[PDB]
Amino acid sequence: TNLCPFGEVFNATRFASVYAWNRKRISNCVADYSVLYNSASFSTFKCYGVSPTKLNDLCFTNVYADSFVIRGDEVRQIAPGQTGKIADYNYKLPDDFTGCVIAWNSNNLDSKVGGNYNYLYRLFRKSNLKPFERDISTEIYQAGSTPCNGVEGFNCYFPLQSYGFQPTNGVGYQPYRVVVLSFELLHAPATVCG
Amino acid sequence: QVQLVESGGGLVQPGGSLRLSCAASGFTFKNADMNWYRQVPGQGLEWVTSIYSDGRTVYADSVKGRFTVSRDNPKSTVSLQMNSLKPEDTGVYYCMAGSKSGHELDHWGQGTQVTVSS
Ligand SMILES: *[C@@H]1O[C@H](CO)[C@@H](O[C@@H]2O[C@H](CO)[C@@H](O)[C@H](O)[C@H]2NC(C)=O)[C@H](O)[C@H]1NC(C)=O
């Protein structure tokens, strides 16, 4: 019964927005990645630094599970060295990233008629994010040389933005649930095997 | 210039009632979706409720039966009747209008602080 809670992340009910992604650290348990492949519901299942076929035979110090929701057009930006609104302003992975990137379509769950305004994404930011940096600031972005004084208007836009997922949208704009597993290896003993 | 003017924050004891208002100017209000979000200092925005142009109202399960959204289309006003408040409802509330026009952006309000504690 010492199994790592995989269902608590993938089979979760709510998924955070990409600008305020949710991270759950997993340690001291048995990680069975074989049941992950036995689902076939994932559109993207790519790993970096390790081979996904040779998984379930490794050990790591800590395992961080970052879960959020973006659209299919932006799933390509969940990779080291990528650019775009998601990779620069919302969730940036390091170049020396050693983990796996899992994603699957959730149109029947994260999309309602008229627009699912529950999910947001940062659109404007004065600079890009660092690896594993989260920016939840709602400061009014100054688009031009005109100041804003915390009030929206001309050249002053709200930093966040909603997706408005609809079931009738294109496949690129439909919502996709992403779970980025980070495998940390330090000089400390490992706690996640199995 | 699209503007959203928020109003109706303030301090309230656990169990009080509030009525936040959103003043919309610069677009067709009768054909726009209006949404409410609250942000506790330290966390991201949480979707509170929404009311579409169809008049359909959708509420989060955390405020089910306690909040209510109004839509005064001639006045172009979004009213959020916040009733039976709890300390967990403390935070800055935002009303935003968005979408329907493609190359547009969701316009947001300036926010109103709401505090509930004793
Ligand atoms: C999320 O829950 C589903 C079921 O609600 C799990 O899917 C498997 O489904 C098969 C066939 O219906 C069952 O025989 C298995 O018992 C289910 N569980 C397995 C294989 O672990 C799904 O695995 C769950 N997701 C996670 C990450 O545990």
Numbering used by the authors:
A (entry chain A): 333 to 526
B (entry chain D): 1 to 118
Question: What's written in the study?
Answer:
To understand the structural basis for the binding of Nanosota-1 to SARS-CoV-2 RBD, we determined the crystal structure of SARS-CoV-2 RBD complexed with Nanosota-1C. When the structures of the RBD/Nanosota-1C complex and the closed spike were superimposed, no clash was found between RBD-bound Nanosota-1C and the rest of the spike protein. Overall, our structural data reveal that Nanosota-1C is an ideal RBD-targeting drug candidate that not only blocks virus binding to its receptor, but also accesses its target in the spike protein in different conformations.
Structural data showed that Nanosota-1 bound to the oft-hidden receptor-binding domain (RBD) of SARS-CoV-2 spike protein, blocking viral receptor angiotensin-converting enzyme 2 (ACE2).
